[PDB]
Design a protein around this ligand. Structure first.
Ligand code: MXI
Ligand code: MXI
Ligand code: MXI
Ligand code: P3S
Ligand code: P3S
Ligand code: P3S
Ligand code: P3S
Ligand code: CL
Ligand code: CL
Ligand code: CL
Ligand code: CL
Ligand code: MG
Ligand code: MG
Ligand code: MG
Ligand code: MG
Ligand code: MG
Ligand code: MG
Ligand code: MG
Ligand code: MG
Ligand code: MG
Ligand code: MG
Lengths: 475, 475, 243, 475
């Protein structure tokens, strides 16, 4: 798309407002609105200003002013606003030099794609993502001097089988979902068919090419929708728009969605599996009929990179304290650093795709939706490329239920990290593969580390956990 | 129907979504949705993937990926979804070899039909089913360390005659159904006429050929709807679609349906009587004007097989712990292994059909709706075929009220099994008739036995029953 | 006899002390799911002319031949004996693994996972005895104590050898070794069935008579086994409402 | 005291019951009651039995039987029970060999005292302890699939200044305690004067020699009572009895006490400061008028041991997950490994005592009351003795407010450990100083490590924290 394409779209759709969007460092989209009458060439030539000091991971207060420049490829009609609105993503730029911002997640993705080309290894990295989520009815929580709580709730939650009535006083009609039992019985066990249909339709209407939708394993309304893969940057833009459409379709229909990794204890977490492949000149590079699981050397070394760099890479792919509550055995999330075909207990699964080279790819199962897809996809690529460049050999595939391994065998396999502080520590110690070609810079890495320590790790560490009262009140 | 018939139907009905369905081992339909735009030749040629490890009785996690291939004969428009949807049943296949899965219930029914043809005994097994159900208003239940409960409720339930008001605060207007008195007074005693009409209409609109609908014996909204018989596999597909339509028609109209065998204590259970007959080259094989109740030798030996194999066959026809609460005297369900014409106390009843050979058949009254109709119909066929093949003579018909037999004559007649663990034990010991022709395989039988022990028998056995408190609190 | 009279008076005193102080006591075997049941362990010994018969310093766990054969009787007759020592439907909810009640028919010293535990008592012959851990308080101590005695006496009289002691955690046995050890019965109807089939050891000397045994069997079937069997369990709704 | 002293006491006090007490591994006293008529010589000669498999950190089920032998020095009349009762502590012994149990905490303290004598360094280790606690009104908590909470409450809690009424509906009369403001205004600001007087009186009546009692810093009823120091084993027996008397005095007066390290967020935690000194032949060893803070070489090396071994020693002195919520800056608990005179921000404070050598001692401020005083005191002694034996020099004292240090300066002094798993890891790697003289054995250490990982560390790590919902619900 071009500037004129977007003006034509705005005029043809009789748009009243344009919503100007960009990504903060942690991974939440930010926006303000301008009237259609203020959406002109000047927006493309001069850009628009905002307060960089109010955005997380951006500027200090005395260097606050920042600039935004539009990305016409991202233009979509908003499905939700009563006043017709056109959404457009922007790149953040220095207001003096007009140089791209070093802490703009969209710029990182841009740099990753260009660095890929410059290596000669490939020209395109394709990402297909599966962002699972929960469709809840309610949530509340607080944290005080003398107490703390959370509660999420959902009509289909198994914890509600004994409820005398529903939240509105209507009768309990059963057909609630058992823990680990949501994947994927027909209605009325599946209570979210019509809502997920609306989500699917909203996505179709925003130009997504859809593949499937279904209830997921978790009780209390776990769900998954799949759309067509795309190249790195487009894929990360798609992810952000997808989360927006999912959350707001739920909202407009009286529900509340979360993408957090582990909202329920003793039921499945929500992952963001990333299917990845490299292509060059319109041809796939991942396939070799003679390799294990049909994998070429390039593919195997990419995996070698992911598994070798995992202890620091998870700082971007599993970036929250809650992430590490998902990385526990028995829930189809990884607990150790292995690859294996057909294996949903592994860190990297190779899906069964047959002899078609175009379909051959790896599924990185470790990542979740709790962070920044621009940074996450970029970091994965940089790990994989380091793997290829250094010919990093992964340890042998383990074609077993990785949660049921004998002690002697399990201990010869590197584990996933236990907690956020460990991966942040490791990122600080070893991040050279990310800085290759200036894709990630030290200022971004240092800001990230600092942000996670001060705003996440420390605040959780100093606050007493309710289960400590269960354990220790009577010491 | 062919692939092109289904594409034409999808296009003519302006379908937005296709719902991909298959059967788990215990007997619940599973589904995910794809857009109409993804429903193409590739769905027929390459199939679709799912996670076999999340489906009960299927795969382990390290061998998770499974494949689905469509069955065009099963294509129907969904009556419920606001976004126009086409439902299609699939067969489950190995993703490497594309071999039919040994634990796909739809495959077992396929295999049973082929085995029948290969014996030369007949070419067609027809099944007519009567799946009774209850239309409740509510249900709740739970199970904790210090207590446990269930409660079902229904406006027409006799337990509510003394209620001051209905659930919504409106007046009690009487005309509630007496225990064992629901079959079948006119409205207003029958409070479900309009709802059953809606169920009937939804079935007609999904291509069912309807025979009748009525209130059943049980208080609190017991019901029965009959549709035309069909050959085994088609009949099992019809049963699954029927349960879906009944449950969801109820759900959309503010009710809640259960097909469990015995939700009410001291009132009728819900059975799945199976009327069965064999045909060859378009001619019936069950009829002989000179036999007892018009039955041929072939028919009598089929019955011999059902009654001889019953102690293990009920593992598939009466597959739940709750099944055995229905097999008690006084409620038109069987308590012993006899056949008899006109006799609703018997295990096999021969309905009165006159001299028309095409109407001659046996009614197996033992089965209920708590399991898997693909496996249940197949197992019944295998038992009946073993009877024909071995010329198993049933014991003499007993034309009496089998609940009022003097202890002396009753002691000579074999009883129905008391509990699930007994039939599971017997299935394990003796299942050769099921494995004939590889219709059932040992892996299916072993998985079934193991599933029932670990997920049903044991969990119920270890949990104190509320009536034990009535009996023993004061010991 | 004195011990059975003591047991009845004890239950009365416990229940009523609780009652007078605003509480309510139950002796049922398993009132809580996922926590310990309540047993009635019976420590037993035979004496003659003021001297103990259970002790032999050379035997496993200090046990004489007389003691070992008594145990042989308890464990051999268990499938029918539990009809009097574990006489309720609720009894069988207690005989599950992980709660210091028995799940199989073995004896073993120091072992709270076993059916018969030999407590550690040292060299004093007067303290030597066996602890039968299987019984609970849900029945009749007069009949329970008597039945245990009759089983133990049949063991002595027929020199019934118990199978070898198993000094392990009987709940953590590998499926292989566990398959070789006889299990405790699963349910009341099984022990009642077995009592009906084989009760000769109880009728010795006319201690139990056939009228008592027949009345017992008939009572348990009609008033306990059948009434529980015909009533849907709440967990069946958890399992099957949505079938 | 002797056996006959105890019999005389029991007879003179007209005791009806004797309470038999011993310590489990984590640090909770266990008990059963025998009638006075069963308390005879046999209790001393033969001992009493119990089920070692029901006691945490003791026996497996197949080796369950354990033996108890009385310690006549510990006999005290119980202040609480209406039926007159004598409490006696016991040692746990092997029932075959009568050898002292290797996992009896009271045995470890016994061993530690003997090992001290055997080194020739000193013959007596004196411990003066300050076990702070909270006097709350209520507590509740739970942990479910979809939510979790705790709440503590106290009339004097600052969170209650805006309450319309008190819990019983009586008026809010103010005079509540500000956060960090409880040390130590007069009544009515101090609302616990009469209750602490009752606690003081019960202690005096159980033969404690009292020094002081006061409100402590924390809002919502923090308190401290001090009794006279003693030698190691007697001191640990005194601590256990003290906790019992405090808890039950509170209970009988309608309150609820906790000794947990950090029950309130943003207010003082509760420590167990341990004042320590070594004496030989009735003379003190800690004093040298020429040393910093009046400390001898022996004293300085003992401190060297404490600080050097701290990373593993805290596994016994700070043994819970909640312990590490107290080791945060700003609350008069340590955040780093320094000693300093007069300094309540330090790990080891040297109180100001003047020129009297008998009063010279070190205050180890790190420990809390959440574990086992027998093991805690013993472990501290072992670390100190290793310091003396190896002449470990502590780093120079730092006479500054350790919480106010700019971050670059703070980083130049070794920190206290962040979390329990770290000290448990370190204990596993390095514990030789504890095994000297067989005082701690490998079986105890391995059981401890194993208990903490399986029952505490892992269960807390897998459970989502309420503040994670505050941080991440909307990711
Ligand atoms: C038959 O030719 C193709 C070409 C590309 C294909 C791509 C996918 C694909 N789907 C997904 C999700 C949406 C299920 C996560 N990811 C991919 C994907 C992602 C990255 N690279 C490739 N090659 C495929 C799936 C099938 C394909 C088939
Ligand atoms: C007059 O010619 C016929 C031919 C087939 C007929 C089949 C039925 C039939 N109806 C039922 C239900 C729906 C009431 C359970 N089952 C059968 C049935 C089933 C299997 N085989 C046969 N022959 C009949 C009933 C009447 C028939 C009459
Ligand atoms: C004047 O002679 C002495 C002798 C011993 C003394 C002991 C203490 C003392 N008090 C405490 C608490 C109760 C406040 C924690 N701890 C000690 C203590 C503990 C261990 N060793 C010594 N020397 C003193 C305090 C003053 C002393 C004064
Ligand atoms: C069924 S699942 O394996 C579940 C994944 C799980 N929720 C996770 O935490 O990654 N996902 P998919 O089959 O869509 O890859
Ligand atoms: C009236 S009934 O006999 C009732 C059957 C009963 N509910 C059963 O449990 O099988 N059924 P039908 O007459 O439809 O065969
Ligand atoms: C501690 S326990 O082993 C518990 C026995 C358990 N309640 C039972 O059901 O037998 N009893 P004891 O040690 O008194 O013999
Ligand atoms: C006033 S304080 O310094 C407070 C100690 C704090 N509660 C702690 O957590 O160690 N105690 P003390 O003066 O009794 O040694
Ligand atoms: Cl962390
Ligand atoms: Cl059963
Ligand atoms: Cl039973
Ligand atoms: Cl920890
Ligand atoms: Mg998926
Ligand atoms: Mg998924
Ligand atoms: Mg996936
Ligand atoms: Mg009918
Ligand atoms: Mg009927
Ligand atoms: Mg019928
Ligand atoms: Mg006992
Ligand atoms: Mg103090
Ligand atoms: Mg203090
Ligand atoms: Mg102090």
């Amino acid at each position: 798309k071009t500037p004129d394409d977007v003006f034509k779209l705005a005029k043809d759709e009789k748009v009243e407002y344009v919503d100007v969007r960009f990504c903060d460092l942690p991974g939440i989209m930010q926006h303000f609105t301008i009237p259609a009458s203020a959406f002109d060439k000047s927006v493309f030539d001069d850009g628009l200003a905002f307060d960089g000091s109010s955005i997380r991971g951006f500027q200090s207060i005395h260097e606050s002013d920042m600039l935004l420049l539009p990305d016409p490829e991202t233009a979509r009609i908003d499905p939700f606003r009563a006043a017709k609105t056109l959404n457009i993503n922007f790149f953040v730029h220095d207001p003096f030099t007009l140089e791209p911002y070093s802490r703009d997640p969209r710029n990182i993705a841009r740099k990753a794609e260009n660095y890929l080309i410059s290596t000669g290894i490939a020209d395109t990295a394709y990402f297909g993502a599966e962002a699972e989520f929960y469709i809840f009815d309610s949530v509340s929580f607080d944290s005080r001097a003398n107490g703390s709580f959370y509660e999420v709730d959902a009509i289909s939650g198994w914890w509600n089988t004994g409820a005398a009535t529903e939240a509105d006083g209507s009768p309990n009609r059963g057909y609630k979902v058992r823990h680990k039992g949501g994947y994927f019985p027909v209605a009325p066990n599946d209570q979210y068919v019509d809502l997920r249909d609306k989500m699917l339709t909203n996505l179709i209407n925003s130009g997504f090419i859809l593949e499937k939708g279904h209830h997921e394993v978790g009780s209390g309304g776990q769900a998954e929708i799949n759309y067509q893969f795309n190249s790195l940057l487009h894929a990360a833009d798609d992810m952000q728009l997808y989360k927006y459409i999912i959350k707001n379709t739920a909202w407009q229909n009286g529900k509340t969605v979360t993408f957090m990794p582990k909202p329920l204890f003793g039921d499945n977490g929500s992952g963001m599996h990333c299917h990845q492949s490299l292509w060059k000149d319109g041809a796939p590079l991942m396939y070799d009929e003679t390799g294990y699981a049909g994998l070429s050397d390039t593919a195997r070394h990419y995996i070698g990179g992911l598994l070798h760099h995992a202890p620091s890479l998870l700082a971007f792919t599993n970036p929250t304290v809650n992430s590490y509550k998902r990385l526990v055995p028995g829930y189809e999330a990884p607990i150790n650093l292995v690859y294996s075909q057909r294996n949903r207990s592994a860190c990297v699964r190779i899906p069964i795709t047959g002899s078609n080279p175009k379909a051959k790819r790896l599924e990185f199962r470790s990542p979740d939706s709790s962070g920044n897809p621009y940074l996450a996809f970029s970091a994965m690529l940089m790990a994989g490329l380091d793997g290829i460049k250094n010919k990093i050999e992964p340890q042998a595939p383990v074609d077993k239920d990785l949660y049921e391994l004998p002690p002697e065998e399990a201990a010869s396999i590197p584990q996933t990290p236990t907690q956020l502080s460990d991966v942040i520590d490791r990122l600080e110690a070893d991040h050279e593969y990310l800085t290759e070609g200036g894709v990630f810079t030290n200022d971004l890495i240092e800001t990230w580390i600092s942000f996670k320590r001060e705003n996440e790790i420390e605040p959780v560490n100093i606050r007493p956990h309710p289960y400590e009262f269960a354990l220790y009140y009577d010491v």
